[PDB]
Curated annotation (Swiss-Prot), chain A:
Similarity comment: Belongs to the bacterial ribosomal protein bL9 family.
Name of the protein in question: Large ribosomal subunit protein bL9m
GO cellular component, one term: mitochondrial ribosome
Lineage of producing organism: Eukaryota, Metazoa, Chordata, Craniata, Vertebrata
Keyword Metal-binding: no
Gene: MRPL9
Biological source species: Homo sapiens
UniProtKB/Swiss-Prot annotation, chain B:
Region (Disordered): 204-223
GO CC terms in record: mitochondrial inner membrane; mitochondrial large ribosomal subunit; mitochondrion; nucleoplasm
Organism: Homo sapiens (Human)
Family that this chain belongs to: Belongs to the universal ribosomal protein uL2 family.
Residue ranges of the TM segments: none
Keyword Ribonucleoprotein: yes
Ranges of compositional bias, category Basic residues: 214-223
Quaternary structure and partners: Component of the mitochondrial large ribosomal subunit (mt-LSU). Mature mammalian 55S mitochondrial ribosomes consist of a small (28S) and a large (39S) subunit. The 28S small subunit contains a 12S ribosomal RNA (12S mt-rRNA) and 30 different proteins. The 39S large subunit contains a 16S rRNA (16S mt-rRNA), a copy of mitochondrial valine transfer RNA (mt-tRNA(Val)), which plays an integral structural role, and 52 different proteins.
Protein name: Large ribosomal subunit protein uL2m
Keywords recorded for this protein, A-Z: Mitochondrion, Ribonucleoprotein, Ribosomal protein, Transit peptide
Swiss-Prot record, chain D:
MTERF repeat spans: 18-48, 54-79, 99-127
Localization terms from the record: Mitochondrion
GO molecular function: double-stranded DNA binding; rRNA binding
UniProt similarity note: Belongs to the mTERF family.
Record's subunit section: Heterodimer with NSUN4; this interaction may be required for NSUN4 recruitment to the mitochondrial large ribosomal subunit.
UniProt key word Hydrolase: no
Function: Regulator of mitochondrial ribosome biogenesis and translation. Binds to mitochondrial ribosomal RNAs 16S, 12S and 7S and targets NSUN4 RNA methyltransferase to the mitochondrial large ribosomal subunit (39S).
Name of this protein: Transcription termination factor 4, mitochondrial
PTM characteristics: The mature mitochondrial protein exists in 2 forms differing at the level of their N-terminus, one is starting at residue 43 and the other at residue 48.
Gene this protein is translated from: MTERF4
Gene Ontology CC: cytosol; mitochondrial large ribosomal subunit; mitochondrial matrix; mitochondrion
Main localization (coarse): mitochondrion
Swiss-Prot record, chain F:
Parent-record interval covered: 48 to 92 of 92
Location within or outside the cell: Mitochondrion
Gene, per the UniProt record: MRPL34
Source species of the chain: Homo sapiens (Human)
Recorded family membership: Belongs to the bacterial ribosomal protein bL34 family.
Subunit structure, interactors included: Component of the mitochondrial large ribosomal subunit (mt-LSU). Mature mammalian 55S mitochondrial ribosomes consist of a small (28S) and a large (39S) subunit. The 28S small subunit contains a 12S ribosomal RNA (12S mt-rRNA) and 30 different proteins. The 39S large subunit contains a 16S rRNA (16S mt-rRNA), a copy of mitochondrial valine transfer RNA (mt-tRNA(Val)), which plays an integral structural role, and 52 different proteins.
Superkingdom of this protein's organism: Eukaryota
Positions of disulphide bridges: none
Stated name of the protein: Large ribosomal subunit protein bL34m
Phosphoserine modifications at: S24
Signal peptide: none
Length: 95, 240, 243, 137, 95, 45
RNA sequence: UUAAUUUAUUAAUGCAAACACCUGCAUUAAAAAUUUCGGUUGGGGCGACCUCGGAGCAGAACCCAACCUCCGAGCAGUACAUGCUAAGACUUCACCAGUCAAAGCGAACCUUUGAUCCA
RNA sequence: GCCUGUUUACCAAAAACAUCACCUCUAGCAUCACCAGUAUUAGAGGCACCGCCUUCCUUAAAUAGGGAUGGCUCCACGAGGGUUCAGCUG
RNA sequence: CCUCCGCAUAAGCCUGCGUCAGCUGACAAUUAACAGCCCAAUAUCUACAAUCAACCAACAAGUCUUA
RNA sequence: GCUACCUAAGAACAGCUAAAAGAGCACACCCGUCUAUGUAGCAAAAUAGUGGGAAGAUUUAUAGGUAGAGGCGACAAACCUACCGAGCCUGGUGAUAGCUGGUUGUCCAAGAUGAAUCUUAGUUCAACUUUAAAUUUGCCCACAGAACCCAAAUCCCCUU
RNA sequence: GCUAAACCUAGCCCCAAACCCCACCUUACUACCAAACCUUAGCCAAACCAUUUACAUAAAGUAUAGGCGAUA
């Protein structure tokens, strides 16, 4: 996402009132483009054996691309939600 | 603008088609190409550039009889009405094509080189190296697009693997799969160059009109100029 | 002269009149209430007060949202509140230089999403922000059911929300027929979002769509006065016979 | 990309015809190795300061020679007065020596027929010019 | 300056004046001498001493500044340890 | 030489300034709306 | 247009971003866009001048022009109290700016260039 | 100026513009112009058909007229611009 | 005595030298055969100018539906 | 609906000479060379004569298209509804104008010739000017006084 | 004595209050055939112009912004 910031500070509007914008308040500077941020990883709980990652029920940090294109769409993995973690915890302790 | 292209016919036919002139205008109605307008009313004869087009419920090499060789208003090359089986179609006539001649259209890449007789269409793989060709396809079955103007002749320069190197009339080499078809010989109306227009009226008949303001950019035509570098600014135009 | 009411209140007045008045109360409240969308294209201030370095005094700070333009194509996709920034910049980022019109557009992707509640795969034009929001929500269905209208900002998204909510409210057996255990599992997973069907019917409907729905609901071919007068005459005759 | 940008420099920023570009890349492919900017400077040196036109540049393979050698010989001739930059009209008081006589020939004939000076003088001038370039940078 | 602002209808202050001049309540304006921080290395000690001084303004200069500032800047200010507290009033002034 | 720029033809008149052409575009609809607001007897030509 | 300022927009490339297409960011171009045309002097030219100072015009308080008649300067040398403070004055006809200075304190025992903002 | 044509509607019709001819540059290709075309093609610019080589006369008096890639060659044409014999004429 | 005039059609205009009584008002009037307003579809068809169309002459290559 | 160009489908071009012609002469038709008239005109570009083309790159009716920094242009800066080096209308708009013009009862009073400035058609400061106020010297002014270098007068002020 | 002169209500202005048969998108006013959303700019002020300016009360023209200047 493109994140921008006004060059010109907007005067305070008040509590219930809405800020009044003028020609100069439409001038922006790009503070950041999120697409250029370093890639982070997705936490997933595997459901089936997958090469070089894990077997089943093990929390894994996978590249978001892989997680969203192969694992999750194919059901090989599930989101590491608290519910999924709990369910796989009962699965583990029931073995 | 309410411009709908006249090229709306969907089914191939022999009958000349009434073609609407463009005047060099887009569908928007603005001039896109200058110097176009007027000229003799013309009718379009749909040319079948896919020489190897086996008839319906038919296949394999087939022959065709040259019903006639006709002048085409829409081309430099003259065309030939040629009939085979139970169909007729317009093709581009080669230099020595005559009415009553027989033309062979084949898709067979024989192990040996087929005797190249002017007018017949064979896959480029079947031709001897160095044969004059025209109506060349870029891809197998695409249809002839190159070497189509009057008197033009490419040369089958080389054949290696499934690829043939052709010399287009612009003396540029082109790589085409040897399965793509081409017709032997040079295109008809070889004397098209020597024609002398003689008078401005003849060009106006041919639909070319004198047109100015052909650039529409600010200042009109502007030849490219070499922008000097800072060191050379001192000597760009030395006063005498 | 002067209008009795401010011109900016005319829409609310109209909502209080006619078919828009007969519209269900919950839908009218949903239209009336307006919440600011989550910051997407600007970094919100951490707190309501700040020590400005110039004079070292505690000054109030407000978050003024950047106007976002959403092209109509966005209504057919799921942009996680992301849109076009139609603004201006200073060439070379110095205010003493030229001021230039600048449009920032999101990077749009085509992705396929599977909805558990709908048991359907949708191909949706999407943004990386939307993908991240889906990941944080732990699934497309969770993202749709959690994200409010303002943050979702997609007619397609709101239609998906209405479909999922109606599916939950009806407990529709059409969700994986011949697999009642799986259907119950899905409904239990998304139980927390269930609402009455009378309300799920009006989720995400534009004002015009709601008006059309209400008109269709309350359209009735007039009863012939023959029936009304016969009922009245029979009732009166019954009263006379009793008396 | 390197080949494409070299050709684009030769065509757009140097106004060499397509045939001229093929001739250049055929006679002396070292142009491709030579980095942009330096090539543009060499061409503009031929065009503006030396007054050479594209046909003559291509005919003499001026781009083949090194910029240091080109400057060493041309500046020597210019300061000697045996070479004059063509004026705005493209004319000169005295016809200039030909590029084959300037660059193609060896130092001996170059100083004996075109410059008519002494080898020691040329060495001194070369060292002086090297210092001038160093200072200019 | 702005005699009637577009939002309040009030008279505005020229803040360039406030950034440069001190008003003593009695009606005097104090200022720094121009160039008092410029190229001191080439100025004689007497010139530097003259330049480092706080200087009063003319009657017409004072009238101009009074016009260019609003009545807020022309009030009594009882600052804690104002160095100019004593100078804010005139004494033994005959006409 | 000049002055007779108007060469009347009902076909051109209606095709150029008629009700249908006015309604054909939002700009023309606003032309009609302005005429209506002004109270013109003749909204279109 | 080799005037100044831009590249928003397109075209190229490059780098990220999504795994041909597209988004962001840079660079180079194309195309353009916005804006300006200092002053005094000089008819037969191919410019000169614009600030400060000295002399005459202007003889004797001050002041006095010019396309007027002449000359000079954009600092250096010195030292490093060539420091700090402060009565009272002068003043280039305004302001800005620029000068001189007793007393006092402190060491010792000097003879021209330009503001504000901004950094 | 090759020519027929075009042009400043309303002060210029021309030697200007176009023009066949020629040269240069750019383009190897299809489903809205170019083009339902394809290098003998298309777009742009330049140039100009074409072809060949590299003091005297006029008057009586004449600031008029005619003659002793480049250099030439004017076939025809012209409400073009000059000069002239003869005639004709307010 | 005069006229590239006149009569029609097209286009345009819209009652704008018909009657009556006082330019205004009232009253009347242009009658379809001419002209306009068309076609039930699906597909399949439709190379071969015109120029007195026959020779002759070409190039600019030229309105062409049955089941 | 003019005009420029273009699209669709139409139409016109006598006679003679010549033969398939951007051919000759010359009607219709188109144009507008030259002259005169007209110049608030018959006409916001005409009339009369004269003249150019007149089977073509022709002329022309009908309908459609291209739209304003745009179109169109056989480039004349030509044309785009009589005034196109960039249409017209509405709006911004009561644009702006250091420039021109105008600025309406009676009566009295005081009232006149440097600096900076993209500045010399303007403005700001000064000087002058007006009003009101405070209190106390103001002008004139003799004697004394104001430079060496190398005239008329002026400055200064006791008295008056 | 001609032309003329005159006239007073037709209405309007600013507030307050109150929220106000048939035909017709085809060539409109013709009875009847197989598709919207998207920064205003610029004049103007800055004595040019280029960033900029220019679409209850009180706090206060204050904090702030600003070729730190016009001004906001
Ligand atoms: Mg007409
Ligand atoms: Mg003074
Ligand atoms: Mg000519
Ligand atoms: Mg004219
Ligand atoms: Mg004309
Ligand atoms: Mg004329
Ligand atoms: Mg004569
Ligand atoms: Mg002619
Ligand atoms: Mg004839
Ligand atoms: Mg002729
Ligand atoms: Mg023309
Ligand atoms: Mg011209
Ligand atoms: Mg001109
Ligand atoms: Mg006009
Ligand atoms: Mg005004
Ligand atoms: Mg008086
Ligand atoms: Mg200045
Ligand atoms: Mg002025
Ligand atoms: Mg201004």
């Amino acid at each position: 996402t493109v994140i921008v910031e006004r060059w010109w500070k907007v005067p305070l509007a008040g509590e219930g009132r809405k800020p009044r914008l003028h020609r100069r308040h439409r001038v922006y500077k790009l503070v950041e483009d999120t697409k250029h941020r370093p890639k982070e990883n997705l936490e997933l709980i595997l459901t089936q054996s997958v090469e070089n990652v894990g077997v089943r029920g093990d929390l894994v940090s996978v590249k978001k691309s892989l997680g969203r294109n192969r694992l999750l769409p194919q059901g090989l993995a599930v989101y590491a939600s608290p519910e999924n973690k709990k369910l796989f915890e009962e699965e583990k302790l029931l073995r | 603008a309410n411009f709908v292209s006249w090229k709306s016919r969907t089914k191939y036919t022999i009958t000349p088609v009434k073609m609407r002139k463009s005047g060099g205008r887009d569908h928007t109605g603005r001039i896109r190409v200058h110097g176009i307008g007027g000229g003799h009313k013309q009718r379009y004869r749909m040319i079948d550039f896919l020489r190897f087009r086996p008839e319906e419920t038919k296949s394999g090499p087939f022959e065709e009889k040259v019903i006639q060789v006709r002048y085409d208003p829409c081309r430099s090359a003259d065309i030939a009405l040629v009939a085979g089986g139970s169909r007729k179609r317009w093709i581009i006539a080669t230099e020595n094509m005559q009415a009553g001649d027989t033309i062979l259209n084949s898709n067979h890449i024989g192990r040996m080189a087929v005797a190249a007789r002017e007018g017949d269409a064979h896959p480029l793989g079947a031709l001897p190296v160095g044969t004059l060709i025209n109506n060349v396809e870029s891809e197998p079955g695409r249809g002839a697009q190159y070497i189509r103007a009057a008197g033009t002749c490419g040369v089958l320069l080389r054949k290696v693997n499934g690829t043939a190197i052709i010399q287009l009339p612009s003396k540029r080499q082109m790589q085409v799969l040897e399965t793509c078809v081409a017709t032997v010989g040079r295109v008809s109306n070889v004397d098209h160059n020597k024609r002398v227009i003689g008078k401005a009226g003849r060009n106006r008949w041919l639909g070319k009109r004198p047109n100015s303001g052909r650039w529409h950019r600010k200042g009109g035509w502007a030849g490219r100029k070499i922008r000097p570098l800072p060191p050379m600014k001192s000597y760009v135009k030395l006063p005498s | 002269p002067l209008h009795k009411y401010p011109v900016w209140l005319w829409k609310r007045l109209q909502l209080r009149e006619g078919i828009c008045s007969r519209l269900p109360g919950h839908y009218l409240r949903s239209l009336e209430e307006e919440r600011t969308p989550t910051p997407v294209h600007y970094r919100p201030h951490g707190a309501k007060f700040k020590i400005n370095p110039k004079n070292g005094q505690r000054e109030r700070v407000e978050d003024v949202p950047i106007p976002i333009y959403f092209p109509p194509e966005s209504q057919r996709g799921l942009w996680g509140g992301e849109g076009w920034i139609l603004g201006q910049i200073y060439a070379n980022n110095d205010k003493l230089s030229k001021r230039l019109k600048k449009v920032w557009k999101p990077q749009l992707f085509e992705r396929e999403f599977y909805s558990e509640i709908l048991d359907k795969k949708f191909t949706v034009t999407v943004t990386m922000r939307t993908l991240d929001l889906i990941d944080e929500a732990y699934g497309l269905d969770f993202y749709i059911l959690k994200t409010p209208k303002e943050d979702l900002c997609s007619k397609f998204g709101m239609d998906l929300k209405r479909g999922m909510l109606l599916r939950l409210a009806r407990q529709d057996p059409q969700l994986h027929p011949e697999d009642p255990e799986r259907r119950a599992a899905i409904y239990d997973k998304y139980k927390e979002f269930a609402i009455p069907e009378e309300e799920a019917e009006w989720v995400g409907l534009t004002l015009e769509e709601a008006i059309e729905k209400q008109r269709l609901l309350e359209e009735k071919d007039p009863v012939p006065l023959f029936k009304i007068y016969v009922a009245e005459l029979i009732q009166q005759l019954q009263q006379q016979a009793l008396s | 990309q390197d080949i494409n940008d070299t050709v684009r420099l030769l065509k757009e920023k140097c106004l060499f015809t397509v045939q001229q570009v093929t001739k250049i890349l055929h006679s002396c492919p070292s142009v491709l190795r030579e980095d942009l900017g330096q090539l543009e400077y060499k061409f503009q040196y031929a065009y503006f300061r030396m007054g050479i036109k594209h046909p003559d540049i291509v005919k003499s393979e001026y781009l083949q020679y090194s910029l240091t050698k080109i400057k060493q010989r041309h500046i020597y001739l210019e300061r000697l007065g045996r070479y004059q930059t063509p004026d705005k009209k493209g004319q000169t008081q005295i016809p200039n020596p030909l590029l084959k006589d300037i660059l193609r020939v060896s130092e001996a004939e170059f100083l004996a027929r075109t410059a008519c000076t002494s080898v020691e003088e040329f060495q001194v001038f070369k060292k002086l010019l090297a210092r001038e370039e160093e200072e200019s940078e | 300056l702005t005699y009637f602002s577009a939002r309040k209808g009030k008279r505005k202050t020229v803040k360039a004046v406030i950034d440069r001049f001190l008003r003593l309540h009695c009606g005097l304006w104090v200022r720094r001498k121009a160039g008092y921080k410029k190229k001191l290395w080439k100025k004689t000690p007497a010139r530097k001493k003259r330049l480092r001084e706080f200087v009063f303004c003319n009657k017409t200069q004072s009238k101009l500044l009074d016009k260019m500032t609003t009545s807020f800047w022309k009030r009594r200010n009882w600052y804690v340890d104002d160095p100019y507290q004593k100078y804010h009033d005139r004494t033994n002034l005959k006409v | 030489a000049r002055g007779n720029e108007y060469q009347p033809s009902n076909i051109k008149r209606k095709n150029k300034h008629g009700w249908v052409r006015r309604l054909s575009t939002p700009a023309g609809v606003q032309v009609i709306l302005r005429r209506m607001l002004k109270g013109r007897k003749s909204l279109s030509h």
